[PDB]
Enzyme design. Structure first.
Site, PDB file in Angstrom:
ATOM      1  N   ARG A 240       0.798  -1.689  -0.051  1.00 41.53           N
ATOM      2  CA  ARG A 240       0.049  -0.070  -0.096  1.00 41.53           C
ATOM      3  C   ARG A 240       0.945   1.330  -0.246  1.00 41.53           C
ATOM      4  O   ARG A 240       0.594   2.023  -0.760  1.00 41.53           O
ATOM      5  CB  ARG A 240      -0.234   0.108   1.486  1.00 41.53           C
ATOM      6  CG  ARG A 240      -1.467   1.358   0.965  1.00 41.53           C
ATOM      7  CD  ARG A 240      -2.653   1.247   2.388  1.00 41.53           C
ATOM      8  NE  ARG A 240      -2.036   1.399   3.748  1.00 41.53           N
ATOM      9  CZ  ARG A 240      -1.128   1.857   4.816  1.00 41.53           C
ATOM     10  NH1 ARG A 240      -1.796   2.856   4.037  1.00 41.53           N
ATOM     11  NH2 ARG A 240      -0.225   1.650   5.466  1.00 41.53           N
TER      12      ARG A 240
ATOM     13  N   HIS B 257       4.316   1.382  -1.130  1.00 42.81           N
ATOM     14  CA  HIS B 257       5.386   1.662  -1.919  1.00 42.81           C
ATOM     15  C   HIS B 257       5.363   1.160  -3.211  1.00 42.81           C
ATOM     16  O   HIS B 257       5.783   1.433  -3.792  1.00 42.81           O
ATOM     17  CB  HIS B 257       6.107   0.922  -1.200  1.00 42.81           C
ATOM     18  CG  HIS B 257       6.517   1.828   0.165  1.00 42.81           C
ATOM     19  ND1 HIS B 257       7.247   2.921   0.342  1.00 42.81           N
ATOM     20  CD2 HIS B 257       6.804   1.036   1.537  1.00 42.81           C
ATOM     21  CE1 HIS B 257       7.893   3.418   1.290  1.00 42.81           C
ATOM     22  NE2 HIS B 257       7.469   2.241   2.161  1.00 42.81           N
TER      23      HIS B 257
ATOM     24  N   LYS C 142       2.058  11.902   6.453  1.00 41.99           N
ATOM     25  CA  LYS C 142       3.617  10.729   6.294  1.00 41.99           C
ATOM     26  C   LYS C 142       4.805  12.339   5.407  1.00 41.99           C
ATOM     27  O   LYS C 142       4.522  12.425   4.643  1.00 41.99           O
ATOM     28  CB  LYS C 142       3.841  10.228   5.466  1.00 41.99           C
ATOM     29  CG  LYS C 142       4.711   8.843   5.486  1.00 41.99           C
ATOM     30  CD  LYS C 142       4.189   7.437   5.212  1.00 41.99           C
ATOM     31  CE  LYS C 142       5.008   6.732   4.507  1.00 41.99           C
ATOM     32  NZ  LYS C 142       5.753   6.339   5.292  1.00 41.99           N
TER      33      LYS C 142
ATOM     34  N   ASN D 135       7.678   9.501   1.276  1.00 40.82           N
ATOM     35  CA  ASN D 135       7.312   8.248   1.075  1.00 40.82           C
ATOM     36  C   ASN D 135       7.585   8.444  -0.276  1.00 40.82           C
ATOM     37  O   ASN D 135       7.829   8.768  -1.725  1.00 40.82           O
ATOM     38  CB  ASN D 135       5.701   7.593   1.360  1.00 40.82           C
ATOM     39  CG  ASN D 135       4.685   6.670   0.735  1.00 40.82           C
ATOM     40  OD1 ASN D 135       5.709   5.786   1.467  1.00 40.82           O
ATOM     41  ND2 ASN D 135       4.396   6.414  -0.563  1.00 40.82           N
ATOM     42  N   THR D 136       8.587   6.918  -0.451  1.00 41.45           N
ATOM     43  CA  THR D 136       8.943   6.487  -2.633  1.00 41.45           C
ATOM     44  C   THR D 136       7.888   5.347  -2.847  1.00 41.45           C
ATOM     45  O   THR D 136       7.970   3.813  -1.970  1.00 41.45           O
ATOM     46  CB  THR D 136       9.574   6.240  -2.348  1.00 41.45           C
ATOM     47  OG1 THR D 136      10.840   6.837  -1.147  1.00 41.45           O
ATOM     48  CG2 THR D 136      10.476   5.851  -3.198  1.00 41.45           C
TER      49      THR D 136
ATOM     50  N   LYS E 166      20.289   0.669   6.808  1.00 38.00           N
ATOM     51  CA  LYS E 166      20.898   2.060   7.826  1.00 38.00           C
ATOM     52  C   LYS E 166      20.786   1.173   9.006  1.00 38.00           C
ATOM     53  O   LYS E 166      21.818   1.651   9.756  1.00 38.00           O
ATOM     54  CB  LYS E 166      19.424   2.640   7.817  1.00 38.00           C
ATOM     55  CG  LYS E 166      20.216   4.160   6.891  1.00 38.00           C
ATOM     56  CD  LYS E 166      20.468   4.006   5.591  1.00 38.00           C
ATOM     57  CE  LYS E 166      18.988   2.782   4.331  1.00 38.00           C
ATOM     58  NZ  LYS E 166      18.852   1.695   4.217  1.00 38.00           N
TER      59      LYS E 166
ATOM     60  N   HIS F 246       9.781  -3.525   4.244  1.00 35.26           N
ATOM     61  CA  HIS F 246      10.041  -2.341   4.541  1.00 35.26           C
ATOM     62  C   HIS F 246      11.084  -1.230   3.511  1.00 35.26           C
ATOM     63  O   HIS F 246      11.903  -2.255   2.317  1.00 35.26           O
ATOM     64  CB  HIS F 246      11.107  -1.736   5.848  1.00 35.26           C
ATOM     65  CG  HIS F 246      10.927  -0.188   6.506  1.00 35.26           C
ATOM     66  ND1 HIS F 246      10.167   0.306   7.067  1.00 35.26           N
ATOM     67  CD2 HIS F 246      12.172   0.663   6.234  1.00 35.26           C
ATOM     68  CE1 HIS F 246      10.185   2.040   7.080  1.00 35.26           C
ATOM     69  NE2 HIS F 246      11.497   1.353   6.940  1.00 35.26           N
ATOM     70  N   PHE F 247      10.721   0.018   2.723  1.00 33.88           N
ATOM     71  CA  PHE F 247      11.986   0.465   1.766  1.00 33.88           C
ATOM     72  C   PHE F 247      12.562   1.515   2.559  1.00 33.88           C
ATOM     73  O   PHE F 247      11.960   2.457   3.571  1.00 33.88           O
ATOM     74  CB  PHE F 247      10.795   1.327   0.924  1.00 33.88           C
ATOM     75  CG  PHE F 247      11.676   2.222  -0.492  1.00 33.88           C
ATOM     76  CD1 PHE F 247      11.382   1.603  -1.193  1.00 33.88           C
ATOM     77  CD2 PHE F 247      12.089   3.622  -0.233  1.00 33.88           C
ATOM     78  CE1 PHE F 247      11.952   1.777  -1.766  1.00 33.88           C
ATOM     79  CE2 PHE F 247      12.561   3.267  -0.777  1.00 33.88           C
ATOM     80  CZ  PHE F 247      13.329   2.999  -2.219  1.00 33.88           C
ATOM     81  N   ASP F 248      13.958   0.892   2.413  1.00 36.08           N
ATOM     82  CA  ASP F 248      14.876   1.273   2.981  1.00 36.08           C
ATOM     83  C   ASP F 248      15.649   2.701   2.693  1.00 36.08           C
ATOM     84  O   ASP F 248      15.899   3.875   3.238  1.00 36.08           O
ATOM     85  CB  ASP F 248      15.762   0.518   3.434  1.00 36.08           C
ATOM     86  CG  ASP F 248      15.926  -0.013   4.640  1.00 36.08           C
ATOM     87  OD1 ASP F 248      15.411  -0.392   5.310  1.00 36.08           O
ATOM     88  OD2 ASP F 248      17.362   0.096   5.385  1.00 36.08           O
TER      89      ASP F 248
END
Length: 124
Positions: free
Chosen positions: A10, A12, A41, A44-45, A66, A119-121
């Site tokens: 949802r 990314h 937010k 966000n990518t 990270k 997760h998008f790092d």
């Protein structure tokens, strides 16, 4: 509650286009994906590739995260993405976002069975 995998999709995934279509892309998308509910937010990518292509990254280049975690993976190829960043005078309930489209490798944290993105790092 939403699973981590579903939340990642949802937040990314946007396989419906190939790149940020306009400068209002982020304003529209952050709203449509319910990322402006109780607060804007800040960053966000969105990745413009098929879900299959993003999930495949979990079998690609294993890199440290990270946060120092070791379940991160970096895509072998670059992908079309759009970075959404809230801008200065942005308050509420109206969120304002700057849309920046780019083609870069993505780095995601993966987990579970199936072993999918949670997760998008970052993007490089």
């Amino acid at each position: 509650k939403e699973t981590a995998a579903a939340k990642f999709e949802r937040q990314h995934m946007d396989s419906s286009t190939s790149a940020a279509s306009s400068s209002n892309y982020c304003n529209q998308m952050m709203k449509s994906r319910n990322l402006t509910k109780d607060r804007c937010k800040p960053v966000n990518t969105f990745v413009h590739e098929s879900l299959a292509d993003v999930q495949a990254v979990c079998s690609q280049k294993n890199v440290a995260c990270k946060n120092g975690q070791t379940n991160c993976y970096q895509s072998y190829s670059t992908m079309s993405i759009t970075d959404c960043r809230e801008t200065g005078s942005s308050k509420g309930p109206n969120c304002a976002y700057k849309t920046t489209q780019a083609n870069k490798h993505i780095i995601v944290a993966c987990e579970g069975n199936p072993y999918v993105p949670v997760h998008f790092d970052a993007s490089v």
